[PDB]
């Protein structure tokens, strides 16, 4: 009936892929996965996984979404057996938006609080804060003794505003007693979901105007802080902390689950967002240059964000009594605790704080928009009734996301906000790309994909990209899955330790998305009315080429198809 929707501008696609790719401020936590005796801890595995796995999978997903012209779930019409990975990545993006909306609400609350002339991170006299009065210690405010306690800095006005003034984490004991949703956080989440609904109800063409500003703002906001990165007196050592060059000295380099999860979250592989954006893209486009530019921009953004966060850490280290590694505050609020501290000391703190919070809100809204749009497009392509009802389905998705986010915006919401997400996310995305690592490669065929790319544009992927799609990336993803399943440590917060049942709940939530692939395989095997050979043929052959099943001509049965690269 209605033709396939397309972008209004080609530059809009390159802006939207970046506006979804900018998650390298809150999710880029180097002190979390930091080194102990290795030196290069996250940079080396980040670069390795971006080179060997990031660009190949990005290019593959882009070309697949552009050629098949379908959603994440409806692309596997090329191979109906591995169609459960579509629902898997849909659930991935849904669980991601669940906790991302809470980050957007936190950013909105901080932006609303920063409007005052006296910032809440400048004093401890209940200046829009909730201190327990047991440790209101302020270093620059009140000169005191060097009672560092390996630099316990959850008592600073910024950290107290974060975990007590915003989150109210003191009232909740942990996951066992989350409490009740906070009213101000509830209003922030309502505003966030209302903005997302008013952005996504009309379609992608409307969001094409919002992605422009939400992507152009961070480029302006980052430079004003980078120019003041090491201009501060003690912040220089921060840069000296980052350029730690170790040639042959490493402990955990080249192998890290968190690095793979971070690169897949930054690029978007394993979520359906790339496939959804490629679905609206025109048939004739250069996925190669787009993927290369996206990877380069993400790498440069990671580099500059690490430089900035380390400069802020060094400044906080020089201004206050310091333990080198623990001077900052861990968790999912790294920026919300590090940047306001340095901004308050900087002259004209109101303007810098407002601009930084506007940037953090704009990146978060765009990321959550890209995450939810993948689910919307996939479920709409799967069920044409949902295509006929765009506004109602968008409202339903946003309302479900708002209702299921109440457990993450409560008093002990953050205890869930990472843990659940983390578990699912990691396993989920791995499994997702893992299945995809087989999907286009073995069952569909690297040769057929290369031929489709050659038919799409003149240039054909060389030996490097094909060997990465067929051998390098599947083996890498299998190794990461194995090291994640075997080398699994119980999830814990800065001080709280989750009970054994929380780990089981997280693993069950991850398995809910994981088992979506074998369940659909069994469904396809049972639904087809035929012999075992006919069932296997209908499973591993495209829908358009099902007639060849009757003619007894299947390429996957012969070994020449598998051996071909």
Ligand X SMILES: CN1CCO[C@@H](c2ccccc2)c2ccccc2C1
Helix (H) or strand (E) holding 258: helix 257-267
Task: Give the binding range for Cl ion (CB under 5 A) out of 45-53, 92-100, 265-273, 498-506.
Answer: 265-273
The Cα 353–Cα 318 span in angstroms is 21
Q: Which x/- pattern over 256-285 shows residues binding ligand X (rule: CB under 6 A)?
A: ---------xxxx--x--------------
The Cα 263–Cα 298 span in angstroms is 9
216-to-12, 25, 195, 203, 367 alpha-carbon distances in Å: 12, 16, 19, 21, 14
- Contact pick of 62, 104, 274, 363 for Na ion (by CB under 5 A): 363
Q: In angstroms, what is the minimal distance from the CB of 371 to ligand X?
A: 3
- Contact pick of 371, 439, 474, 506 for ligand X (by CB under 6 A): 371
- Contact pick of 38, 174, 179, 181 for a copy of itself (by CB under 8 A): 179
Q: Do residues 387 and 246 make contact, with C-beta atoms less than 8 angstroms apart?
A: no
State yes or no: residue 97 binds ligand X (CB under 6 A): yes
Q: Which is nearer to ligand X, 48 or 433 (CB)?
A: 433
Helix (H, G, I), strand (E, B) or coil at 410: strand
What are the DSSP calls for 45-102, one per residue?
HHHHHIIIIIHHHHHHHHHHHHHH-S-TTGGGGGSGGGGHHHHHHHHHHHHHHHHHHH
Site for Cl ion in 321-350 (CB under 5 A): none
Helix (H, G, I), strand (E, B) or coil at 361: helix
State yes or no: residue 180 binds a copy of itself (CB under 8 A): yes
Q: Which is nearer to Na ion, 371 or 474 (CB)?
A: 371
Helix (H, G, I), strand (E, B) or coil at 181: strand
User: What are 101's two structure tokens?
Assistant: 């909306």
Q: Which is nearer to Na ion, 84 or 97 (CB)?
A: 97
- Residue 314's contacts (CB-CB under 8 Å, 6 or more residues apart) are 230, 234, 235, 236, 237, 238, 239, 240, 241
Q: Which is nearer to a copy of itself, 113 or 401 (CB)?
A: 401
Known binding-site residue numbers: 19, 21-23, 26, 35-36, 93, 97, 265-266, 298, 330, 366-367
Handedness of CA 194, 200, 206, 210 (dihedral sign): positive
Q: Residue 165's Cα: distance from chain center in Å?
A: 26
State yes or no: residue 388 binds a copy of itself (CB under 8 A): no
State yes or no: residue 30 binds ligand X (CB under 6 A): no
Q: Do residues 341 and 331 make contact, with C-beta atoms less than 8 angstroms apart?
A: no
Closest residue to ligand X, judged by C-beta, is 268
- Contact pick of 12, 23, 61, 381 for ligand X (by CB under 6 A): 23
Site for Na ion in 3-22 (CB under 5 A): 19
User: What are 32's two structure tokens?
Assistant: 């979390």
State yes or no: residue 519 binds a copy of itself (CB under 8 A): no
**Nearest partner of 215 among 43, 59, 9, 48, judged by Cα:** 9
Known binding-site residue numbers for dopamine: 23, 93, 265, 330
State yes or no: residue 106 binds ligand X (CB under 6 A): no
- Which of Na ion, Cl ion, a copy of itself, none does residue 176 bind (CB under 5 to 8 Å by kind)? a copy of itself
State yes or no: residue 504 binds a copy of itself (CB under 8 A): no
State yes or no: residue 501 binds a copy of itself (CB under 8 A): yes
Q: Which x/- pattern over 148-177 shows residues binding a copy of itself (rule: CB under 8 A)?
A: ----------------------------xx
Q: Phi then psi for 181, rounded to 5 degrees?
A: -65, 135
508-to-265, 400, 421, 428, 500 alpha-carbon distances in Å: 21, 20, 12, 11, 13
Q: Which is nearer to ligand X, 306 or 371 (CB)?
A: 371
Q: In angstroms, what is the minimal distance from the CB of 332 to Cl ion?
A: 16
Size of the site for ligand X (CB under 6 A): 15
- Which of ligand X, Na ion, Cl ion, none does residue 302 bind (CB under 5 to 8 Å by kind)? Cl ion
* Interacting residue ranges for Cl ion, rule: CB under 5 A: 26, 30, 266, 302
Q: Which residues bind ligand X (CB under 6 A)?
A: 23, 25, 93, 96-97, 100, 265-268, 271, 367-368, 371, 425
């Amino acid at each position: 009936a209605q033709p396939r929707e397309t972008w209004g501008k080609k530059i809009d696609f390159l802006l939207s892929v970046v506006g979804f790719a900018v998650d390298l401020a809150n999710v880029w936590r180097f002190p979390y996965l930091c080194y102990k005796n290795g030196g290069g801890a996250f940079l080396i595995p980040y670069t390795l996984f971006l080179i060997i796995a990031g660009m190949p999978l990005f290019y593959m997903e882009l070309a697949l979404g552009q050629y098949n012209r379908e959603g994440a779930a409806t692309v596997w019409k090329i191979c109906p057996f591995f169609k459960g990975v579509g629902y898997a990545v849909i659930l991935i993006a849904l669980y991601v938006g669940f906790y991302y909306n809470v980050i957007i609400a936190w950013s909105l609350y901080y932006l609303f609080s920063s409007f005052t002339l006296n910032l809440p991170w400048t004093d401890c006299g209940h200046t829009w804060n909730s201190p327990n009065c047991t440790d209101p210690k302020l270093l620059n405010g009140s000169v005191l003794g060097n009672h560092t306690k390996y630099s316990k800095y959850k008592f600073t006005p910024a950290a107290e505003f974060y975990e007590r003034g915003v989150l109210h984490l003191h009232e909740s004991s942990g996951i066992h007693d989350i409490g009740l949703p906070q009213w101000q956080l509830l209003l922030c989440l309502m505003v966030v979901v209302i903005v997302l609904y008013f952005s996504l109800w009309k379609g992608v063409k409307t969001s094409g105007k919002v992605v422009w500003i939400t992507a152009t703002l961070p480029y302006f906001v980052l430079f004003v802080l980078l120019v003041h990165g090491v201009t501060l007196p003690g912040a220089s050592n921060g840069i000296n902390a980052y350029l730690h060059i170790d040639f042959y000295r490493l402990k955990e380099a080249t192998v890290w689950i968190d690095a793979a999860t971070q690169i897949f979250f930054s690029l978007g592989a394993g979520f359906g967002v790339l496939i959804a954006f490629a679905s609206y893209n025109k048939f004739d486009n250069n996925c190669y240059r787009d993927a290369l530019l996206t990877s380069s921009i993400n790498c440069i953004t990671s580099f500059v964000s690490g430089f900035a966060i380390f400069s802020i850490l060094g400044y906080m280290a020089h201004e206050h009594k310091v333990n080198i590694e623990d001077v900052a505050t861990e968790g999912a609020g790294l920026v919300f605790i590090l940047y306001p501290e340095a901004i308050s000391t900087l002259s004209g703190s109101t303007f810098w704080a407002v601009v930084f919070f506007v940037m953090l809100l704009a990146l978060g809204l765009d990321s959550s928009m890209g995450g939810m749009e993948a689910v919307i497009t996939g479920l709409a392509d799967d069920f044409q009734v949902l295509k006929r009802h765009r506004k109602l389905f968008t409202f339903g998705v946003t309302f479900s996301t708002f209702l299921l986010a109440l457990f993450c915006i409560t008093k002990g919401g953050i205890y869930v906000l990472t843990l659940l997400d983390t578990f699912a996310a990691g396993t989920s995305i791995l499994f997702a790309v893992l299945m995809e690592a087989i999907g286009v490669s073995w069952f569909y065929g690297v040769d057929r994909f290369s031929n489709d790319i050659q038919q799409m544009m003149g240039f054909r992927p060389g030996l490097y990209w094909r060997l990465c799609w067929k051998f390098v990336s599947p083996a890498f993803l299998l190794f990461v899955v194995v090291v994640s399943i075997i080398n699994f440590k119980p999830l814990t917060y800065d001080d709280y330790i989750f009970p054994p049942w929380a780990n089981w709940v997280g693993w069950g939530i991850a398995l809910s998305s994981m088992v979506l692939v074998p369940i659909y395989v069994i469904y396809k095997f049972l639904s087809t009315q035929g012999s075992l050979w006919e069932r296997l043929a209908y499973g591993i052959t495209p829908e358009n080429e099902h007639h060849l099943v009757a003619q007894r001509d299947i390429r996957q049965f012969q070994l020449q198809h598998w051996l071909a690269i």
